[PDB]
Write a protein that holds these residues in place. Structure first.
Motif, mmCIF file in Angstrom:
data_model
loop_
_atom_site.group_PDB
_atom_site.id
_atom_site.type_symbol
_atom_site.label_atom_id
_atom_site.label_comp_id
_atom_site.label_asym_id
_atom_site.label_seq_id
_atom_site.Cartn_x
_atom_site.Cartn_y
_atom_site.Cartn_z
ATOM 1 N N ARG A 1 24.629 51.174 48.860
ATOM 2 C CA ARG A 1 24.696 52.516 48.306
ATOM 3 C C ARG A 1 25.579 52.613 47.072
ATOM 4 N N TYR A 2 26.237 51.523 46.684
ATOM 5 C CA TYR A 2 27.146 51.512 45.542
ATOM 6 C C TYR A 2 26.551 50.802 44.331
ATOM 7 N N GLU A 3 25.234 50.569 44.341
ATOM 8 C CA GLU A 3 24.570 49.825 43.276
ATOM 9 C C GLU A 3 24.865 50.406 41.898
ATOM 10 N N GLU A 4 24.681 51.719 41.735
ATOM 11 C CA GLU A 4 24.837 52.320 40.413
ATOM 12 C C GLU A 4 26.283 52.280 39.941
ATOM 13 N N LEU A 5 27.233 52.623 40.819
ATOM 14 C CA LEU A 5 28.641 52.521 40.452
ATOM 15 C C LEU A 5 29.008 51.097 40.087
ATOM 16 N N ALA A 6 28.525 50.133 40.871
ATOM 17 C CA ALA A 6 28.858 48.735 40.625
ATOM 18 C C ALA A 6 28.300 48.273 39.290
ATOM 19 N N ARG A 7 27.082 48.701 38.956
ATOM 20 C CA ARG A 7 26.497 48.294 37.686
ATOM 21 C C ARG A 7 27.249 48.894 36.510
ATOM 22 N N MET A 8 27.754 50.119 36.660
ATOM 23 C CA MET A 8 28.596 50.703 35.620
ATOM 24 C C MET A 8 29.873 49.891 35.440
ATOM 25 N N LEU A 9 30.524 49.543 36.552
ATOM 26 C CA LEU A 9 31.770 48.784 36.472
ATOM 27 C C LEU A 9 31.532 47.382 35.924
ATOM 28 N N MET A 10 30.428 46.750 36.318
ATOM 29 C CA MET A 10 30.078 45.449 35.755
ATOM 30 C C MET A 10 29.884 45.546 34.247
ATOM 31 N N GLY A 11 29.339 46.669 33.780
ATOM 32 C CA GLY A 11 29.167 46.884 32.354
ATOM 33 C C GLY A 11 30.470 46.977 31.587
ATOM 34 N N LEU A 12 31.579 47.236 32.277
ATOM 35 C CA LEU A 12 32.912 47.162 31.694
ATOM 36 C C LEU A 12 33.487 45.756 31.755
ATOM 37 N N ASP A 13 32.679 44.778 32.169
ATOM 38 C CA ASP A 13 33.097 43.386 32.317
ATOM 39 C C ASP A 13 34.062 43.185 33.477
ATOM 40 N N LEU A 14 33.937 44.006 34.514
ATOM 41 C CA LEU A 14 34.586 43.743 35.788
ATOM 42 C C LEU A 14 33.612 43.024 36.704
ATOM 43 N N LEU A 15 34.145 42.127 37.518
ATOM 44 C CA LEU A 15 33.376 41.488 38.573
ATOM 45 C C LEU A 15 33.528 42.354 39.816
ATOM 46 N N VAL A 16 32.430 42.964 40.239
ATOM 47 C CA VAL A 16 32.416 43.877 41.370
ATOM 48 C C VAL A 16 31.967 43.096 42.589
ATOM 49 N N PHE A 17 32.627 43.324 43.715
ATOM 50 C CA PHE A 17 32.224 42.654 44.941
ATOM 51 C C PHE A 17 32.425 43.591 46.122
ATOM 52 N N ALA A 18 31.695 43.317 47.200
ATOM 53 C CA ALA A 18 31.716 44.190 48.361
ATOM 54 C C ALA A 18 31.212 43.401 49.552
ATOM 55 N N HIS A 19 31.462 43.944 50.734
ATOM 56 C CA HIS A 19 30.747 43.506 51.919
ATOM 57 C C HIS A 19 30.460 44.712 52.797
ATOM 58 N N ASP A 20 29.503 44.542 53.706
ATOM 59 C CA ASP A 20 29.269 45.550 54.727
ATOM 60 C C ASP A 20 30.320 45.347 55.811
ATOM 61 N N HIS A 21 31.062 46.410 56.120
ATOM 62 C CA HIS A 21 32.070 46.322 57.158
ATOM 63 C C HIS A 21 31.409 45.934 58.478
ATOM 64 N N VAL A 22 32.205 45.337 59.369
ATOM 65 C CA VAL A 22 31.661 44.955 60.660
ATOM 66 C C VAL A 22 31.007 46.168 61.318
ATOM 67 N N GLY A 23 29.890 45.916 61.996
ATOM 68 C CA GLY A 23 29.151 46.989 62.630
ATOM 69 C C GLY A 23 28.329 47.848 61.698
ATOM 70 N N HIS A 24 28.211 47.475 60.421
ATOM 71 C CA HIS A 24 27.502 48.285 59.439
ATOM 72 C C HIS A 24 26.500 47.439 58.671
ATOM 73 N N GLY A 25 25.448 48.099 58.195
ATOM 74 C CA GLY A 25 24.517 47.503 57.261
ATOM 75 C C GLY A 25 23.950 46.181 57.738
ATOM 76 N N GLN A 26 24.110 45.144 56.923
ATOM 77 C CA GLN A 26 23.560 43.829 57.210
ATOM 78 C C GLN A 26 24.590 42.881 57.806
ATOM 79 N N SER A 27 25.764 43.383 58.155
ATOM 80 C CA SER A 27 26.780 42.572 58.802
ATOM 81 C C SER A 27 26.585 42.605 60.312
ATOM 82 N N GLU A 28 27.226 41.658 60.986
ATOM 83 C CA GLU A 28 27.118 41.580 62.433
ATOM 84 C C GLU A 28 27.989 42.645 63.094
ATOM 85 N N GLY A 29 27.834 42.766 64.399
ATOM 86 C CA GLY A 29 28.667 43.641 65.206
ATOM 87 C C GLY A 29 27.851 44.771 65.799
ATOM 88 N N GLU A 30 28.200 45.169 67.022
ATOM 89 C CA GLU A 30 27.584 46.354 67.600
ATOM 90 C C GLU A 30 27.754 47.525 66.638
#
Ligand SMILES: CC1=CC(C)=[N+]2C1=Cc1ccc(CCC(=O)NCCOc3ccccc3CC3CC4(C3)CN(C(=O)N3CC5(COC(=O)N5)C3)C4)n1[B-]2(F)F
Length: 290
Positions: free
Chosen positions: A52-81
């Motif tokens: 859900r942060y694709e657009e914000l991340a692409r804006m920040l990358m355009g400032l020459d920042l390296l943007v990174f993220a993960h899905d917290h445990v139990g969320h999205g494509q990460s493991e966990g109940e």
């Protein structure tokens, strides 16, 4: 048979990280073509995920920042109940692991945090564990004080769950209609199969209340520069928490912007709000990377 995401994709086919509990976290990276000027970790909130942060991340990358993220445990494509966590600090520990790993790969670069809602509480607690080490934090309606109706509902239910053995007791879901005045964004939230929209487990709500309590204790230790964005009509994170964060954080570089009438998800609000949000984050991060 390899380890797979909850959606059955092998982790060997995706960017990932194994946390201290042996759980696979799905990761995302948006790196510029040139040399990065800074790193920034994006911390999503409850129920949602890092995509859900694709657009914000692409804006920040355009400032020459390296943007990174993960899905917290139990969320999205990460493991966990789903939407369960043994203790809220798991989220902070896992952010720190990923930040520390990226800092090794890109030494010398300043590191920023950006977090929304529960992810903003995670960012606050992450920065409080490492005073002096983060260059800045961007907070979009962080969980500092819960909406009082929600807090009272779960505090009463927490009395049942903390005194009996009721592991699956649930309350209502996070209400989608209060997320944004932008109806299309509400509809998108309700359409995304990577978003968990079930009723909140009382044990998870208890961890959200733990987050509020720990944020309060962390504020005297919080010195990181921050930009704080808050809607005045937020029925999920009480705007009073944003004012209290401004008052109680010891940071020498702290700025609050209030969006009058806006709901919770400011980066997915009406276009006038969202455009301002993107512009303000761009400028604030730019000034502090130069
Ligand atoms: C007169 C009345 C009767 C009843 C019955 N109610 C009344 C009034 C009100 C007013 C508000 C509510 C309910 C508001 C609501 O939905 N609470 C959900 C439960 O929250 C909590 C439960 C336990 C602890 C803490 C909370 C608050 C946190 C803030 C978050 C829940 C939102 N999340 C988050 O990280 N993120 C990312 C998202 C998802 O994706 C996005 O993009 N952003 C949202 C953390 N009521 B009422 F109670 F209905």
């Amino acid at each position: 048979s390899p380890r797979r995401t909850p959606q059955s994709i092998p982790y060997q086919d995706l960017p990932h990280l194994v946390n201290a509990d042996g759980q696979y976290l799905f990761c995302r990276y948006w790196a510029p073509t040139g040399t990065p000027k800074a790193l920034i970790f994006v911390s999503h909130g409850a129920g949602e995920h890092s995509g859900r942060y694709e657009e914000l991340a692409r804006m920040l990358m355009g400032l020459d920042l390296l943007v990174f993220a993960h899905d917290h445990v139990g969320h999205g494509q990460s493991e966990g109940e789903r939407m369960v966590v043994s203790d809220f600090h798991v989220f902070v520990r896992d952010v720190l692991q990923h930040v520390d790993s990226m800092q090794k790969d890109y030494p010398g670069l300043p590191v920023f945090l950006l977090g929304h809602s529960m992810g903003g509480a995670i960012a606050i607690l992450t920065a409080a564990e490492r005073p002096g080490h983060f260059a800045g934090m961007v907070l979009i309606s962080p969980l500092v004080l819960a909406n009082p109706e929600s807090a009272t509902t779960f505090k009463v239910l927490a009395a049942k769950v903390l005194n009996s053995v009721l592991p699956n007791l649930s309350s209502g879901p996070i209400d989608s209609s209060v997320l944004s005045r932008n109806k299309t964004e509400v509809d998108i939230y309700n359409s995304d199969p990577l978003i968990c929209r079930a009723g909140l487990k009382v044990c998870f709500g208890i961890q959200l209340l733990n987050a509020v309590s720990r944020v309060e204790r962390a504020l005297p230790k919080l010195t990181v520069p921050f930009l704080l964005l808050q809607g005045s009509a937020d029925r999920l994170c009480d705007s009073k928490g944003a004012y209290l964060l401004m008052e109680l954080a010891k940071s020498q570089d702290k700025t609050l912007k209030i969006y009058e009438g806006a709901y919770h998800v400011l980066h997915k609000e009406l276009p006038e709000v969202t455009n301002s949000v993107f512009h303000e984050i761009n400028m604030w991060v730019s000034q502090r990377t130069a």
